[PDB]
Amino acid sequence: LSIGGGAGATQAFLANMPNSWISMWRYFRGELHFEVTKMSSPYIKATVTFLIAFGNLSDAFGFYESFPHRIVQFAEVEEKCTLVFSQQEFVTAWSTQVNPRTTLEADGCPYLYAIIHDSTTGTISGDFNLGVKLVGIKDFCGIGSNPGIDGSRLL
Amino acid sequence: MEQNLFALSLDDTSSVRGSLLDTKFAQTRVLLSKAMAGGDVLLDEYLYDVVNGQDFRATVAFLRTHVITGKIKVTATTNISDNSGCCLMLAINSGVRGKYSTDVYTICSQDSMTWNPGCKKNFSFTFNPNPCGDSWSAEMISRSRVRMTVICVSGWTLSPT
Amino acid sequence: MEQNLFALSLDDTSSVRGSLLDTKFAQTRVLLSKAMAGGDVLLDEYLYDVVNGQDFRATVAFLRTHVITGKIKVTATTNISDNSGCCLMLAINSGVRGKYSTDVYTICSQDSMTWNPGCKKNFSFTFNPNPCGDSWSAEMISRSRVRMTVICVSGWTLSPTTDVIAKLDWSIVNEKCEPTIYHLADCQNWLPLNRWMGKLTFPQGVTSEVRRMPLSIGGGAGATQAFLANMPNSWISMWRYFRGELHFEVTKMSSPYIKATVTFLIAFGNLSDAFGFYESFPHRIVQFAEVEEKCTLVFSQQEFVTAWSTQVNPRTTLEADGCPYLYAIIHDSTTGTISGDFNLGVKLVGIKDFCGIGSNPGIDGSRLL
Amino acid sequence: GPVCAEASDVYSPCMIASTPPAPFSDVTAVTFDLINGKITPVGDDNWNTHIYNPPIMNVLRTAAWKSGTIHVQLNVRGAGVKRADWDGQVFVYLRQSMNPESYDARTFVISQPGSAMLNFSFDIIGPNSGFEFAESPWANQTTWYLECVATNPRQIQQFEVNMRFDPNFRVAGNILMPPFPLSTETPPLLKFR
Amino acid sequence: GPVCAEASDVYSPCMIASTPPAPFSDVTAVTFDLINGKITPVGDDNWNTHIYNPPIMNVLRTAAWKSGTIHVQLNVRGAGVKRADWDGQVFVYLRQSMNPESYDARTFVISQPGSAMLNFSFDIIGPNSGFEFAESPWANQTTWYLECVATNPRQIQQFEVNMRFDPNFRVAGNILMPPFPLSTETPPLLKFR
Amino acid sequence: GPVCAEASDVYSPCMIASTPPAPFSDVTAVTFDLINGKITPVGDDNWNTHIYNPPIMNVLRTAAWKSGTIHVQLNVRGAGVKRADWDGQVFVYLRQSMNPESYDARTFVISQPGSAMLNFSFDIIGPNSGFEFAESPWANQTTWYLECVATNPRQIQQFEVNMRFDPNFRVAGNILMPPFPLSTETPPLLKFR
């Protein structure tokens, strides 16, 4: 959720104008909007669940479902699904961009989580791809000017 | 400051209410074979045991409430490609004795639920563990040995990958 | 039947509410030695860690709620025989660094709670973990490393037969969490300092007893080759001179068996220890019922002619001192049918109608009491 | 110009650091942690690190959360040298974290034969409700280190840091610290006899 | 005068260029393209060209259209030299296009024995609705090159460009760029051992 | 002081004059006619007189009547000299007419080892309705000559005049001029090879 500086790439980061611009502030917050698209054949069925949580979370956790979340299924045709995360899912603003060499547990900024609720499946070999794009921030709030920090985490 | 404690918000006997988030007290993971023509027993287990691992908002309050007032909502999640069929069933029963029949006709006499993950993505319903009362506790269905079951009624018309 | 799930009672963000039963999220067991005269550290631990073992109705929801809306209610349980005294304290602080001072004056600057299990059975209060917000999460106080502490301020006036323990009932009560920020406004309606004043000790016998406390609480409190100071006290040191209505919370930490009448008043330093006519100066006489534990002292503006220096130089003779002093004199004589001391906890909680005068250049350390 | 503006206010000294004694001639620097009161030279170079206890300094390391602006005056004193020989310089770098990526906040460079002073001011603004807990791993908050470097450590004798709180400052929350070692001012003339 | 004004704000470094190593003694200069982040020395003179990636720098070359004012602080560091020997100078030229006809925007000249800094600010104003697409051949729009020259490249060691966005700045439109090479800050002391 | 104010705006160069080549060592000066764009050295001393054609310069000699204020920035560049040897100085005289009686308008004196710059501004106010036709024999109107002199013509290499129009400026009336000789800027480095 620290989309500052831009996205990853070997020995260099690439960034559009917007993202590059929000990097202008140190910390920030506001209502998050998201547009998750299904890019796999409607044959590849799978139920994914989203939520905001922190990094220290184990991969074998399991009780994600105790945190406030949204469950997403896809009808044979439905293509887009909008995710809204109100101000109540963040206690306080967070750093726009954090240092790349930061352990996953030392990270103190929220994360958008995507967990498989049940299990992906199909009668045809294939993958269940999902496009996640942060479209905008409602009631944005930029805090102080950001000195900067070269590059950013890689995903 | 100090205060008298005998009379505090401590002798609460009321049943768990709230959102389906503070109400979620159990999440069980049940697997399906890559092939099962019929009569397969996907998972059988005493109802009360479905909580063993679990630890959700409602879990804790579930056990510690002497008298529950609401039905249990069980919701299954599972979808398969349009070109494939299959039929599952979840059925609860008040009790069981000896080497019982796991057949379909045997379990769907009491509260049951049947469906096809091929056309209807996720299925769910509400039941009442105490078939002759209007109340029931965690310790209840544990002692009266309420058994719930999951079976495959008809195989996959086509095998998933 | 089947149903759409994206829109269900699943994206609930609301803070935990309910009875003190569904609100109890932590129960910590803290022990007491069969003997501990003072300054003992009963138990120190990061706030967030108080939940480690715990598993109550509210526990689970406590961690998984992104934003809590209610204060935390901590309740201690512990009683001891009428013929014995003792004084405990639970104090939370926003953070800690390095080998910190576990002393009393250091921790009670922020939200704290003091009491005597000898006369008041169980003590509790509500605090706000986020001192500058109105919200806070479980993950919050875990990262910002909020440390809470438990200390013994005055020993047992008499030793119990066995070691004892006091339980804690951490709950998230339904109260609005409010901030407590310090401004630099020279004139303030009310400013809290919770700066400790000292552990007064009155030995038995008809000994002529008197104690002085510097009203020049600048720089901080004493310590060998170094001064220790909390944020508040450290902050008021920002001004040269000051004044306003003084509030004080004097607690009894000795067994209710140790009876003694103490009299307070504001006076200067040059006063002799064999004076006697203190009682001609405006004062307040304090007795303690078998159970009464706290007594509030208020000194209005009329007890000070003009503002006074926040902090004065340590190497200043007691007679050359020109700043008021809070006095504690024995009116009659401390007494008891059991060997023990009549300890008194004096803490300056706040200044009503504060008035800070000019910026203070500073001055290293401060008098030692 | 040849006239000098009136420069007022109270600016109690907080952190002072002297350059290594002779014959150390290499270029060396020092880093000040303006918010927590910790000084650290570059390598194992011998500097004279002193942390004072002004009422202001104190509040900084005893106050968990802080928000507002800080006024700073850095003074550079040098050891007497024939003017026309001076080659010293001072590169002061204001930054949020020494981690090599993070870029400078502000950047100064001055070459004053003898000694000079430069006043600047940063803004402590945080994520909470405007407060930034000095280096807390919560929102991966920073602090404010001010790294000063000297070209010729022989001509530049010391870096003095003076800071004043701006009236808009506010803080809440106490951080339990260890007793504070009594540190007095050493500028009076080094007089003995 | 002898007192120094408070000079605040955040001014992250963007472009830095060092003068050719010895024995190059001729007069040489360098040109900065403040809006696109491209540095180019005069001839085939060996300079040390580095382009950093401050949040600010980034937006400049990733934003097609931009309108507002820009604050700049140019710093000049020099290699230690006996003061009374300094003959260096720096002629900074702010201009819209290097095409020989086009006349300077602003013109500066300074001779600071040791090192100095000069702050100035230009206004990016364009034909669209007030926006000027950096060098687009549409309205034959320009950019803003800042050419700095050094008298004695031996005494003047480097030109540092710091720039801050003024609050009235606005931009719209993204220009697809190639991945940005990771460029970190080299000022920490060149310490090895 | 050691920090420098932000000095903005556009100040296109108008008139530039270089001091005579060696071995001319006597004291010499030059006079600028700020309003008509005519440069004239003292005697038959060899200076390098160049008149540029900024949009601003142009209007000045093509506009008969003019009223308002003018901003000026005079820059002095000098040829590299060991600092501790500099004895140069510059006496700039702003005046209405060279006729010996007429007294100076404003008077400046500066001695900057290396090179400096001084900004000042006069007010073109006339008898018509506030307009002053540059040197018209009507109300025996004047103009504005700015005479600059150099102590040591060897250390001081040139006088550069930059001027910006203040927004309150207004002009009316055209004066037929002869075609304007194309005059380009010669500051780029005198690079050949």
Residue numbers of A between 6 and 35 with CB closer than 8 Å to D: 26-27, 29
Within 8 A by CB and 6+ apart from D97, the residues are: A99, D142, D143, D145
| Site from E9, E85, E104 to mutate, F interface, most F CB atoms within 10 angstroms | E104
Distance CA(A138)–CA(C107), nearest Å, equals 41
> Is the minimum CB–CB distance between D98 and chain C shorter than 8 Å?
no
Distance CA(C229)–CA(C101), nearest Å, equals 9
Domains and CATH numbers, chain D: 1-193 (2.60.120.20)
Cα distances (angstroms) measured from residue C319 to each of B103, C270, C315: 100, 4, 12
Asked whether C235 and D173 are in contact (CB, 8 A), the reply is no
Greatest alpha-carbon span in chain A: 53
> Is the minimum CB–CB distance between D112 and chain F shorter than 8 Å?
yes
Q: Hey, are the CB atoms on A88 and C14 less than 8 Å from each other?
A: yes
Cα distances (angstroms) measured from residue B19 to each of B25, B76, C9, C217: 12, 18, 5, 53
β-bridge pairing C308-309 and D63-78: unpaired
Minimal CA separation from D74 to chain F, in Å: 12
Distance CA(C254)–CA(C334), nearest Å, equals 11
> Is the minimum CB–CB distance between F84 and chain D shorter than 8 Å?
yes
Distance CA(E44)–CA(F114), nearest Å, equals 27
Helix runs in chain A, H state only: 17-22
Q: How many CA atoms lie within 13 A of F147 on its CB side?
A: 17
Q: Which residue has the tokens 């296009």?
A: E97
| Six token digits for residue E176 | 């697809």
Distance CA(C52)–CA(C59), nearest Å, equals 10
Instruction: Please report residues of A whose CB lies closer than 8 A to that of E171.
Output: 17, 21
Q: Hey, are the CB atoms on A121 and B158 less than 8 Å from each other?
A: no
Instruction: Please report residues of B whose CB lies closer than 8 A to that of C123.
Output: 1-2
Distance CA(E69)–CA(E55), nearest Å, equals 17
Q: Give the chain C residue nearest D184 (alpha carbons).
A: C364
Distance CA(C357)–CA(C242), nearest Å, equals 6
Asked whether F71 and F56 are in contact (CB, 8 A), the reply is no
CB-closest option in C9, C23, C61 to B20? C9
Minimal CA separation from E163 to chain F, in Å: 12
| C-alpha F50, offset from chain centre | 11
Asked whether A29 and A103 are in contact (CB, 8 A), the reply is no
Measured CA angle at A76 (ends A70, A78), to 5 deg? 55
| Six token digits for residue B33 | 């074979």
Residue numbers of D between 6 and 35 with CB closer than 8 Å to C: 9-10, 12
> Is the minimum CB–CB distance between D137 and chain C shorter than 8 Å?
yes
Distance CA(F133)–CA(F125), nearest Å, equals 10
Within 8 A by CB and 6+ apart from D135, the residues are: D35, D36, D141, D142, D143
What are the backbone angles phi and psi of residue A88, rounded to the nearest 5°? -65, -5
Phi-psi region of D25 (alpha: psi -120 to 50; beta: other; left: phi over 0): alpha
Under CATH, which number does the domain C1-369 receive? 2.60.120.20
Entry resolution in angstroms?
2.3
Q: Hey, are the CB atoms on F6 and E93 less than 8 Å from each other?
A: no
Tally C-beta pairs within 8 A across A and E. 70
Distance CA(C77)–CA(C71), nearest Å, equals 20
Ranges of beta strands (E only) in F52-105 are 63-78, 90-95
Within 8 A by CB and 6+ apart from F171, the residues are: F59, F63, F64, F65, F66, F67, F131
3-class DSSP state of A21:
helix
3-class DSSP state of D84:
helix
Distance CA(C160)–CA(C81), nearest Å, equals 8
Q: How many CA atoms lie within 13 A of E22 on its CB side?
A: 3
Residue numbers of D between 114 and 173 with CB closer than 8 Å to E: 116-123, 149, 151-152
Count the Cβ atoms, other than its own, within 10 Å of residue C134: 13
Q: Hey, are the CB atoms on C5 and B122 less than 8 Å from each other?
A: yes
Distance CA(E168)–CA(E67), nearest Å, equals 8
Asked whether A30 and A136 are in contact (CB, 8 A), the reply is no
Helix runs in C25-144, H state only: 59-63, 104-107, 138-143
Instruction: Please report residues of E whose CB lies closer than 8 A to that of F184.
Output: 100-101
| Six token digits for residue B92 | 């609860």
Q: Hey, are the CB atoms on D122 and E78 less than 8 Å from each other?
A: no
Within 8 A by CB and 6+ apart from B122, the residues are: A47, A73, B75, B76, B77, B78, B79, C2, C3, C5
DSSP letters, C182-199, are B---SEEEEEEEEEEEEE
| Six token digits for residue D160 | 């003095």
Measured CA angle at F32 (ends F30, F37), to 5 deg? 140
Distance CA(C241)–CA(C223), nearest Å, equals 24
Distance CA(D124)–CA(D130), nearest Å, equals 9
Asked whether E189 and D149 are in contact (CB, 8 A), the reply is yes
Distance CA(F39)–CA(F33), nearest Å, equals 6
Instruction: Please report residues of C whose CB lies closer than 8 A to that of A86.
Output: 13
DSSP letters, chain B, are -B---SSSTT---PPP-S-TTTS----------S---S-EEEEEEEGGGGGSS---TTHHHHHT-SSB-S-EEEEEE----TT---EEEEEEES---SS---SHHHHTTSSEEEE-TTTSSEEEEEE-SSTTSS-B-HHHHHHTT-EEEEEEEE--SS---
Distance CA(D19)–CA(C85), nearest Å, equals 57
Subunits next to C (3 or more Cβ pairs <8 Å) are A, B, D
| Six token digits for residue C75 | 């309740």
Contact yes or no, B with E (3+ CB pairs under 8 Å): no
| Site from A64, A88, A109 to mutate, C interface, most C CB atoms within 10 angstroms | A88
CB-closest option in D56, D58, D172 to C180? D172
Distance CA(C40)–CA(C93), nearest Å, equals 18
Distance CA(F36)–CA(F143), nearest Å, equals 8
Residue numbers of D between 33 and 72 with CB closer than 8 Å to E: 42-43, 71
CB-closest option in A62, A73, A125 to B161? A125
Distance CA(C344)–CA(A82), nearest Å, equals 63
CB-closest option in D99, D101, D127 to A94? D127
Q: Give the chain D residue nearest E155 (alpha carbons).
A: D87
Asked whether D97 and D35 are in contact (CB, 8 A), the reply is no
Residue type, C118: G
- Give the closest residue to C343 by CA, choosing from C127, C84, C103, C147: C84
| Six token digits for residue C170 | 């951490």
| Site from A2, A3, A11, A17 to mutate, E interface, most E CB atoms within 10 angstroms | A17
Minimal CA separation from E61 to chain F, in Å: 23
| Site from A2, A149, A152 to mutate, D interface, most D CB atoms within 10 angstroms | A149
Helix runs in F37-158, H state only: 55-62
| Six token digits for residue F112 | 């900057």
> Is the minimum CB–CB distance between D99 and chain E shorter than 8 Å?
no
Task: Say if residue C313 is exposed, middle or buried (CB neighbours under 10 Å; 0-12, 13-18, 19+).
Answer: middle
CB-closest option in B77, B78, B81 to A43? B81
Instruction: Please report residues of D whose CB lies closer than 8 A to that of E77.
Output: 89, 91, 109
> Is the minimum CB–CB distance between D180 and chain A shorter than 8 Å?
no
Q: Give the chain D residue nearest F3 (alpha carbons).
A: D118
Q: Which residue has the tokens 């500052």?
A: A4
Q: Give the chain E residue nearest D101 (alpha carbons).
A: E184
| Six token digits for residue C168 | 């804690």
Give chain A's end-to-end CA distance (angstroms, integer). Answer: 12
- Give the closest residue to A140 by CA, choosing from A63, A73, A87, A69: A87
> Is the minimum CB–CB distance between F112 and chain E shorter than 8 Å?
yes
Please provide the size of chain E in residues. 193
Distance CA(B94)–CA(B90), nearest Å, equals 14
Distance CA(F66)–CA(C42), nearest Å, equals 88
- Give the closest residue to D65 by CA, choosing from D146, D137, D130, D144: D130
Q: Give the chain A residue nearest C61 (alpha carbons).
A: A66
Q: Hey, are the CB atoms on A145 and E10 less than 8 Å from each other?
A: yes
Tally C-beta pairs within 8 A across A and C. 49
- Give the closest residue to C200 by CA, choosing from C317, C302, C309, C334: C334
Instruction: Please report residues of B whose CB lies closer than 8 A to that of C23.
Output: 9
Asked whether D117 and D75 are in contact (CB, 8 A), the reply is yes
Per-residue 3-state assignment (H helix, E strand, C coil) for chain E: CCCCCECCCCCCEEEEEECCCCCCCCCEEEEEECCCCEEEECCCCCCEEEECCCHHHHHHHHEEEEEEEEEEEEEEEECCCCHHHCCCCEEEEEECCCCCCCCCCEEEEECCCCCEEEEEEEEECCCCCCCCCCCCCCCCCCCCEEEEEECCCCCEEEEEEEEEECCCCEEEEECCCCCEECCCCCCCCCCCC
DSSP letters, A116-140, are ESS--B-SSS----EEEE---EEEE
Q: Hey, are the CB atoms on C98 and D177 less than 8 Å from each other?
A: yes
Is the Cα torsion angle D188, D189, D190, D192 positive or negative in sign?
Answer: negative
What are the backbone angles phi and psi of residue F60, rounded to the nearest 5°? -55, -45
> Is the minimum CB–CB distance between A103 and chain D shorter than 8 Å?
no
| Six token digits for residue D140 | 């991966």
Distance CA(E24)–CA(C176), nearest Å, equals 71
Within 8 A by CB and 6+ apart from A28, the residues are: A22, A93, A94, A96, A137, A140, A141, A142, A143
Q: Hey, are the CB atoms on E63 and A17 less than 8 Å from each other?
A: yes
Distance CA(A57)–CA(E110), nearest Å, equals 58
3-class DSSP state of C171:
strand
CB-closest option in E12, E165, E178 to A147? E12
Distance CA(C346)–CA(C153), nearest Å, equals 12
> Is the minimum CB–CB distance between C305 and chain D shorter than 8 Å?
no
Q: Hey, are the CB atoms on D139 and A94 less than 8 Å from each other?
A: yes
Give chain C's end-to-end CA distance (angstroms, integer). Answer: 75
Distance CA(E141)–CA(E126), nearest Å, equals 8
Distance CA(B127)–CA(D101), nearest Å, equals 59
